[PDB]
UniProtKB/TrEMBL annotation, chain A:
Belongs to the TrbG/VirB9 family. The keyword Metal-binding does not apply. It comes from the Bacteria. This is TraO. The chain holds residues 177 to 271 of 294 of the full protein. The gene is traO. The keyword Signal applies. Keywords: Plasmid, Signal.
TrEMBL record, chain B:
This is TraN. The chain holds residues 21 to 42 of 48 of the full protein. Residues 1-22 are annotated as: Disordered. It comes from Salmonella typhimurium.
Amino acid sequence: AGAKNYQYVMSEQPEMRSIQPVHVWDNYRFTRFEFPANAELPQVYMISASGKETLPNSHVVGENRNIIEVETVAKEWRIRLGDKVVGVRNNNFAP
Amino acid sequence: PPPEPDWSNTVPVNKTIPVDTQ
């Protein structure tokens, strides 16, 4: 337990607000994503060192399992689900 | 319709900040 740094930014679009992630915070070990309880949990991708999107091993936690803990830390996250997408970017990078 | 993140107003994902006031 110490001082963590969670600096994220997501595209502000009222159309993709449905899958819009509530809040996001990472850690030196793993990263967690908080999503609405009334909404569905989408799949969060990550931009590999190559240039394409890759789906990292995700996990589910929380009192309602509305959280998604990904086993990796990057600077660019691509949340996709159904026919909507929400671009997220981490401006800090602790690890 | 095609979503695509236009980053129109680019809204952060940290507003509440989990710190738990004591």
